[PDB]
Amino acid sequence: STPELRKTWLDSMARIHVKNGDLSEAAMCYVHVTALVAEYLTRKGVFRQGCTAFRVITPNIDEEADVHFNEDVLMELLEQCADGLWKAERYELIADIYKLIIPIYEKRRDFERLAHLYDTLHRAYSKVTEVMHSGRRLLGTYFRVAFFGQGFFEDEDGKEYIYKEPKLTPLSEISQRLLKLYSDKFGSENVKMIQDSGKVNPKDLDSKYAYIQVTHVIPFFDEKELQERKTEFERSHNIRRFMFEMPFTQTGKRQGGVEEQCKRRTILTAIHCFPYVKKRIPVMYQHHTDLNPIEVAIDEMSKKVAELRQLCSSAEVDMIKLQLKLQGSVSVQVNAGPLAYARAFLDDDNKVKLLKEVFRQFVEACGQALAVNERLIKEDQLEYQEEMKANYREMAKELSEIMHEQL
Amino acid sequence: STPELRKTWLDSMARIHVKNGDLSEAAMCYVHVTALVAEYLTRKGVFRQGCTAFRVITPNIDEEADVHFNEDVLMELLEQCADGLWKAERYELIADIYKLIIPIYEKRRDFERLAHLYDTLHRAYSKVTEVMHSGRRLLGTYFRVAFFGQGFFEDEDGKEYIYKEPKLTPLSEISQRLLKLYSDKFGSENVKMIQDSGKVNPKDLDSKYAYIQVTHVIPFFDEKELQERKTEFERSHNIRRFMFEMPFTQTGKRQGGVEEQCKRRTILTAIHCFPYVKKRIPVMYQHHTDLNPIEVAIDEMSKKVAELRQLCSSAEVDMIKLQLKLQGSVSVQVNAGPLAYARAFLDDDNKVKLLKEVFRQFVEACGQALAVNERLIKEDQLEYQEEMKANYREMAKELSEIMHEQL
């Protein structure tokens, strides 16, 4: 009766996820229950595959390795996973469930059930093209969370998690929520937020306090993964690794001038993939890679050319967002400006070469952005557009003074 | 270039089938072309299965055992089979085609194409439940056709075919059509219709004439096949065997009295299954089984009890059709009446027993039919209903006089 007991726990977890609006975690709970019934029934010779058939839906399925269990029960559970995944807005995964039941319905000649599942699949793929175009699907945002204070957290002390939050939950929201939660259960004066995103050395914490560290992360993928995961959905599903970028300087640290600014990229690996049957998952392993100030400079410049390109390459261009980015490259008011990188590194280690390359595409990109904007502006700008053009010319002149080149 | 040449012939056949409105034969032509491209591409390692993957759609596929051929071409051919089978109203077979392309669309992330095929599948299964309820799907009627007259038909002389005709084409229609066709091309006075459904001995034909024999047949299934083919569609698709029933008497023959009436059931096997890439298919093999007059009597009685039962067992009963059948069992005006069987065989070979059995269910069946009709009649009958009740009572009395039993 372990299988029955596991189902009971998973069913109970799912209900809570449903009340909380965490419908992907409910859906994984349905999938895990269905996987365990399928495993059981395949062993009995009643169904042709167990657990591993669901691995495409979630690698976490490995964790699951009566006449309360039979074909009818499996069928209803499959139907539940399909509707569960619909509600979680993970449309792309519905066919993986339905492939498992289709042959059963065919064998039973149940044509009304076949009609129903195909209608769902059609709607699912329609939603997919729809949200792929509109960006209105928000599958969640992620944070590293770690607690500190033996006296307060008991066993939770020092443990790091990745938290998967609903929709577009911002740092300000989760950090204030957790601050509240524990302020309430320990007293506001005994709870401290650690803002520093670096490793916290416990030896410099005050035992008198409960500390909470929250840091925003995004899913991380290497080159090989970026090539296998070709859509936003595929980069939002079955994700185990997360990354954030932290400023430092050698004289330690964080925020400095361009000449001194380093960056540490930290990759964190969770023990399970998201989404899972829980919305927070222990960190298993981590590591990092540091970049030089010239490397940081190269990094930021590239993300800017790619950005301006994407904006221009669009079928239909978003003018405001194009203007936001263009203005902020050529008409900088507040920050140091793109040129500060050129002065600091391109004024007469030979990966100086590469920063030069990037700056070459940047001037062309801003160039393209101007051309595009010219055709979108409705006169009431035009002066605005003129200035940016003037700014852009001026800027090109200087980069030549520095790179001794055209542009 | 045989594969290319076969495709050319199949494509050409299909066009003709389309102009003629024989959309199942066009559809089989699409399937055969698709099967041959799949065979080719599987051998090249470009696709994971050829010919045999289409055997579920049609066993005739075995007959099919460039950079004009590639994945894109296969995909378009698959799409064509799906639409072809839709137009032929063979909805149940569309998924067999789409299973072959689904993984290709998934691999290419082509979500709009996935959406489209699932919409078709949903509509297909909706049509299936719809026509399963309404009987408005008419997939065709079949006839044995055989020609005679060396001087006229050359090589066609003596050859037997099964012809698959559109919709509900009746004997009167195909027989008059073929009579015309050949009357036109030989002269009306040189063409004779053979109505006799028995084997025609050529030795008693007049060489001076062209003869045509047309005989209506229906698909034939043994017990094992009736159990595997559980729907009307499954008994209308991939059919190789056909049957008709012919009266004879020992003093030869055809139509006699109940005491002398025999029946020959002839089973004919076509060289290919229907539907095929042609609407007429050579007969390969045949055989027959004769029934006794008492066997004929048993046969007809059963078909009558089953008939009355089906009519009564209906969710919603069809009153007229119930009345037609009921009246024709208990209030017989023209023909000899059910009792003629009882007199001829049940008046004081011990399968006499079985005829007794059947007559037992028949009286009960007519009984049930009366009860049912009582609740459907709208007064303006009632007298009519009363008479049939009176007729039924009278009839029961006599069968007791004969079987010495209740009833």
Add this chain to the structure above:
Amino acid sequence: SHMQTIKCVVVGDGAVGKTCLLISYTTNKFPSEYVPTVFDNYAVTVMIGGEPYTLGLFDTAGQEDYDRLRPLSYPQTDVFLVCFSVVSPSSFENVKEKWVPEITHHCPKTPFLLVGTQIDLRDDPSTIEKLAKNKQKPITPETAEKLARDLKAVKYVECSALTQKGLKNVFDEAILAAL
């Protein structure tokens, strides 16, 4: 949804071949080839304007022994088929004298068609001779159409169960008239 079952009652003299043609048509058998049945009445599915229809053909005895019971089957009738053989002048006569009177007594507003039978016998030398010796000839379509318009029959149709000529059309028209 469920297919609809038209009630068609068939009347006419007893030796004009009416049952023969009902059995031939509904079994898709030439007249000599069908297994005789001891049961009465027939159902056949027909396609009209692209749609299927179940046609219920209620057979009647044309003899006087049955004048009483026959009209019982007349309630609920959607269409009547009034049959005579075109090589039997008495048949034709009975259409006028017995048959349409009877059906329009009971069903004043239900349509009926005049059905001419055994049209392949217009060509039979022996049949024409037998008719000749009483100064008669087979009924022609012209003369049958007349009776049809005068009696208020929807129309006249004719056929040979033997040659199958006109057979399909007869029941196509019966369904068209019921609709």
Add this chain to the structure above:
Amino acid sequence: SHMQTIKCVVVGDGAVGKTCLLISYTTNKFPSEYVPTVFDNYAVTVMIGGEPYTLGLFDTAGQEDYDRLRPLSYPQTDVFLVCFSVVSPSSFENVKEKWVPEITHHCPKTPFLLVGTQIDLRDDPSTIEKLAKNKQKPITPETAEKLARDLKAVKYVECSALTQKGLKNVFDEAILAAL
């Protein structure tokens, strides 16, 4: 279909922490933790009434060196955010004296909100002391709301980039005002 990109222009004095809070919010980083950028302006996607929205935050220099160029970015603006620090009386003053005059000169009908910043500094002993020696106290919400209704600001919102308190709400309101 395609998601819609609200134009929000941010103005206010140069040392009230305005850029800091734009960067903190849009990068989801505490003020001390973000990688400095040499670029200006920020985009962030926010969910309002169940729907996503791209918010374009156009940053401006609050210095006089920029009075000329700054207003160039004002055409096409859907909403203004007028920022002052609640522990800087001159900031507040400039809202009245420079900032709303400027934006309502150029965009008479575009909504704006009053944004109070550095609210975590109301609690700082040193900051309160510095203000005290000039006979001043940190601005309260009450006094800020007043200025907001008198100036015709849609409303007053305030926040600390440091503690993250009120930060999300500030830009939720900016989007609500643009709609």
